[PDB]
Amino acid sequence: TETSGDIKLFGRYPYTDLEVKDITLEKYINVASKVILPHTSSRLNTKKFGRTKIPVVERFVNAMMRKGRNNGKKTLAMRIVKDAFFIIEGVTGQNPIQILVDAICNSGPREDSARIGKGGVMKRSSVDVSPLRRINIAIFLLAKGVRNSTFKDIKMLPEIIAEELINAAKNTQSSFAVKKKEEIERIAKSNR
Amino acid sequence: MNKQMIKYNADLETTFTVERKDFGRTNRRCRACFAYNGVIRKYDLMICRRCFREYAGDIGFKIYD
């Protein structure tokens, strides 16, 4: 219908010339795999690092099927994010994809708190997070910020997605996800 | 048995007959043990769940899966 060219996301977005821009993250973020629609059934979850090979916007829609009542409603999630990309592409002026990439980069906490004490009482200490866990937490926080913001507010959900992601990419205090990344890093330092 | 009952119309003078329908436990007693409870009625068996399990292998039922 719309095009007879090369594969673009939602048939709209360029799908090339994409940079991660944190060498600690490089291997764990799939922006290679050209797909027309953020849907795949590829059975990688039954593997040792197979959940790191799933494409980026896929991981991002999965995060929306939550709050219990929305389990399994993956079409609804795609409908929501499609609209958000229109809002963001407009607002930012750059491939929605680079906004999403930079949101992840900023929103993962680098140091964390954990119990270390084995042969006695369990005493809390700071510890250093792996690349993979760092990105897992980034998606979690971005999602949790969005969900709770929309609950009993008149604004449309696709609009709230655009509010948070811009701010997160720009590392502003305005993001719920960014603030909570500061909190975790401050407490980690308190227990250092 | 299909039993019959007389009934009178509103005049209390004319009479008509109606048939009692056979339903409920009263005629579905277990064919092995006369029990009224837990009778399997499927495939025109009329045998209780206790009696079924001892005879099932004689009838020809098996647990494949």
Binding site: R79, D83, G90, V91, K155, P158, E159 | -
Partner: protein
């Protein structure tokens, strides 16, 4: 205070001056900046998109999105 069921003349006048230089605008903005109800943010927004003052950029199911005089899209 509760929301309103009219767009009076002086609110109407200043909305025209405000809708230029705004980028993407939506049902909520008219109803959360000014005091209008959702049932009168629809009617005013639909009117401005007939007058060529704004332009519609999406209308998928009931989700409906508009643009003003300082919008500019991506380029290849």
């Amino acid at each position: 205070v509760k929301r309103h069921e009219r767009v009076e003349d002086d609110i109407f006048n200043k909305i025209v001056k405000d809708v230029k230089n705004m980028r993407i605008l939506t049902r909520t903005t008219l109803s959360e900046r000014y005091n209008l109800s959702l049932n009168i943010s629809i009617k005013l927004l639909r009117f401005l998109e007939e007058n060529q003052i704004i332009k519609l950029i999406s209308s998928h199911r009931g989700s409906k999105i508009y643009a003003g005089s300082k919008y500019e899209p991506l380029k290849v």
